[PDB]
């Protein structure tokens, strides 16, 4: 029994917003985020409470600013530790187009702005390499895919122009048939794959989803008999397309799955995204949602919609057990 962790993050104004002289309608204090409706200024502002509240509207010179490193060391390290404990984990970024989902998950591979995914990978390998018990050995395999109009593309295998089939293994759940799963032995190798994968994405409103998966295997060697008990945790880091057809089936279905789970049949199979993430939503997985928010008055409805779906997500609870 573990509830879905939910964080909200508000970014700086973008060019569109500055050009319309947008005012900031988002306020944050502690774990409370309040949104002002520019349309009805005298109506009571709506407040929401979340596990994490990242005020990233200003800049690093600000004392209360939430940087990439701070967002990661917070929710990121939390989930990585769960993976070390043997739990499957998932972190997905959700929000309006341009709200800051990719910046939070991937960031920029330059000076100081790496997002959750690169940092977690670096942290994962750093920890593995600091192991001092020779009875422990590890394996790290990675997969990276894109879901566009219900079709799946293998980002680590651009040579291939066929969309992979999402299937249901009779006993082990959903999987992408013939999706590349590469073993990596260093942060540098996994980062090259990440960079290669990011470049083959399409290709400026995204309407594809990106799923970066890591299969982290921990092998404990028992000295006396020679059996090696395995510990496997799947780490799924998701960067969703923004919210505003076959192009939007996945996002709408996710909304319904999230609402249904919060309400407690579920249309998991109604879309490739919810099908593949079935166990992370209501299964054996420690899951977190990072809701990206625009700070601008002009996006009140979209932002309010995001806050509401993030509020429901908070109510989801999943039965978790360590994979030993």
């Amino acid at each position: 029994g573990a509830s879905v962790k939910v964080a909200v993050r508000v970014r700086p104004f973008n060019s569109r917003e500055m050009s319309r002289d947008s005012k900031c309608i988002i306020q944050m204090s502690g774990s409370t985020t309040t949104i002002v409706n520019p349309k009805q200024p005298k109506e009571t502002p709506k407040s929401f409470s979340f596990d994490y509240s990242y005020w990233s509207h200003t800049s690093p010179e600000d004392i209360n600013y939430a940087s990439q490193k701070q967002v990661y060391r917070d929710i990121g390290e939390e989930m990585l530790q769960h993976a070390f404990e043997g739990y499957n984990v998932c972190i997905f970024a959700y929000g309006q187009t341009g709200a800051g989902k990719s910046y939070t998950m991937m960031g920029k591979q330059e000076k100081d702005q790496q997002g959750i995914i690169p940092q977690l990978c670096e942290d994962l390998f750093s920890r593995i390499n600091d192991t001092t018990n020779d009875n422990m050995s590890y394996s790290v395999e990675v997969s990276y895919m894109e879901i566009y109009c219900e079709r799946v593309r293998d980002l680590l295998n651009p040579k291939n122009k066929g969309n992979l089939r999402v299937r249901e293994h009779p006993l082990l759940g959903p999987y992408v048939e013939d999706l590349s799963k590469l073993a990596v032995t260093s942060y540098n190798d996994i980062q090259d794959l990440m960079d290669s994968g990011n470049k083959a994405r399409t290709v400026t409103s995204s309407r594809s989803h990106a799923v970066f998966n890591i299969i982290f295997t921990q092998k404990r060697h028992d000295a006396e008999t020679n059996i090696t008990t395995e510990k496997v945790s799947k780490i799924s880091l998701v960067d969703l397309a923004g919210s505003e057809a076959n192009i939007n089936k996945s996002l709408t279905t996710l909304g319904k799955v999230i609402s249904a789970l919060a309400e407690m049949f579920i249309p998991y199979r109604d879309s490739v995204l919810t099908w593949l993430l079935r166990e992370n939503l209501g299964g054996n997985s420690r899951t977190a949602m990072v809701a990206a928010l625009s700070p601008a008055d002009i996006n009140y409805d979209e932002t309010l919609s995001t806050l509401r779906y993030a509020d429901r997500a908070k109510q989801i609870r999943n039965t978790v057990s360590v994979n030993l």
């Binding site: 009805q40 309006q96 919210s243 505003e244 057809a245 076959n246 192009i247 939007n248 089936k249 996002l251 709408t252 279905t253 909304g255 319904k256 109604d270 409805d301 979209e302 919609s305 779906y309």
Partner: protein
């Protein structure tokens, strides 16, 4: 001086062919005479084709008949965004090509059917693109909003909560004629359980003739289009008055025809004669534009109305002393040669804003939720360039239309 018209959606086109018929009929311009002054839009060819195959075939220019051979789709999204988009330019072009040719116009009488694909969506952006290209004019859209219980499309509300929110901030005055509440009139005030769509059309085709046609026509008390919106909307919300006609008597059955003013005017406020299932269940009128036509003595009116102003059970808003725009025309109505309309020598096409629609909107909004509450046919729009935004954010929209139509009344 003039007023272009854009009949959008099969319906808006059927009604169009009708209103367009009544016209020449009372202007002595047979099949092939002058030249219309409107356009026809639809994403289903076969319907506009009916104007290309059937009657009033050569009275139009294949230029004011826009079609998108593609697909209609009983869904807003597709018609507004995705498909409907492709045509709009072209559409506009005519309402910019037809808007130029004229001489100091006044606006565009738009004809659409709220709960459709080409009618809800498309227009949404048509009126949308107008409010910007000619903000300096009148945008009176004549709608046929969702039958209170006898709707057709399964989604209807999705399509009508969406045409309202997108057009709201663009129309001047939106006239409303309820498809079902018109049937009643065909059952109760004309007697016929055989009402073909071709009839309801003859009816609006009448009430409408009283708006533009005759009004833009000289008389003893002329009323310009602007006049309406001015004397008819108390507030910027593209406020929607209701259309009503008086001598809706049968040209066969009963015959008391000679029903002096004093009668035909009282016959407007009885709820069973208003082309809208918005029975004045409480809705306080806040402005009525009594358009009369035919042989009418101004005193007869400035008396028949006086009697009304003091019936009280007809309670008018507070903040409104007098809300009675008396429009008098000369030429009596003009009934189809042999349809089923009586044919009197005077009529009253009274339209008005009534706190009543507080209902009609309510009952139509609720609908929406029920389905949205389960996303029902949502995947049909999303996959058509829309989002959880446009729905949820157009719901909130009307919400303040339920409060608006509530505040502007019920309170003093």
């Amino acid at each position: 001086r003039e007023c272009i018209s854009i009949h959008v959606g099969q319906a808006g086109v059927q009604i169009g062919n009708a209103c367009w018929e009544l016209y020449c009929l009372e202007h002595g311009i047979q099949p092939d005479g002058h030249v219309p002054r409107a356009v026809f839009v639809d994403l289903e060819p076969t319907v506009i084709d009916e104007v290309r195959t059937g009657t009033y075939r050569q009275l139009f220019h294949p230029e004011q008949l826009i079609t998108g051979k593609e697909d209609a789709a009983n869904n807003y999204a597709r018609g507004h965004y995705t498909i409907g988009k492709e045509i709009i330019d072209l559409v506009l072009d005519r309402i910019r090509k037809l808007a130029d040719q004229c001489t100091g116009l006044q606006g565009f009488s738009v004809f659409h059917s709220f709960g459709g694909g080409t009618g809800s969506g498309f227009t949404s952006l048509l009126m949308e693109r107008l409010s910007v290209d000619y903000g300096k004019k009148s945008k009176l859209e004549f709608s046929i909003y969702p039958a209170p219980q006898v709707s057709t499309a399964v989604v209807e509300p999705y399509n009508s909560i969406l045409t309202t929110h997108t057009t709201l901030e663009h129309s001047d005055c939106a006239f409303m004629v309820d498809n079902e509440a018109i049937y009643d009139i065909c059952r109760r005030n004309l007697d016929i359980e055989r009402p073909t769509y071709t009839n309801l059309n003859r009816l609006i085709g009448q009430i409408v003739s009283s708006i533009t046609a005759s009004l833009r026509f000289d008389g003893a008390l002329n009323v310009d289009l602007t006049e309406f919106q001015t004397n008819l909307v108390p507030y910027p919300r593209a406020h929607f008055p209701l259309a009503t006609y008086a001598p809706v008597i049968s040209a066969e059955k009963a015959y008391h025809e000679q029903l002096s003013v004093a009668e035909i005017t009282n016959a407007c406020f009885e709820p069973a004669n208003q082309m809208v299932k918005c029975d004045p269940r409480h809705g306080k009128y806040m402005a009525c534009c009594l358009l009369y036509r035919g042989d009418v003595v101004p005193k007869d009116v400035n008396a028949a109305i006086a009697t009304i102003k003091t019936k009280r059970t007809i309670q008018f808003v507070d903040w409104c002393p007098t809300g009675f725009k008396v429009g008098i025309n000369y030429e009596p109505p003009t009934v189809v040669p042999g349809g089923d309309l009586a044919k009197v020598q005077r009529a009253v096409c009274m339209l008005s804003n009534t706190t009543a629609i507080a209902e009609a909107w309510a009952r139509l909004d609720h609908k929406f939720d029920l389905m949205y509450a389960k996303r029902a046919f949502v995947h049909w729009y999303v996959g058509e360039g829309m989002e959880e935004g446009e729905f949820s954010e157009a719901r909130e929209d009307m919400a303040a239309l339920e409060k608006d139509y509530e505040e502007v009344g019920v309170d003093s």
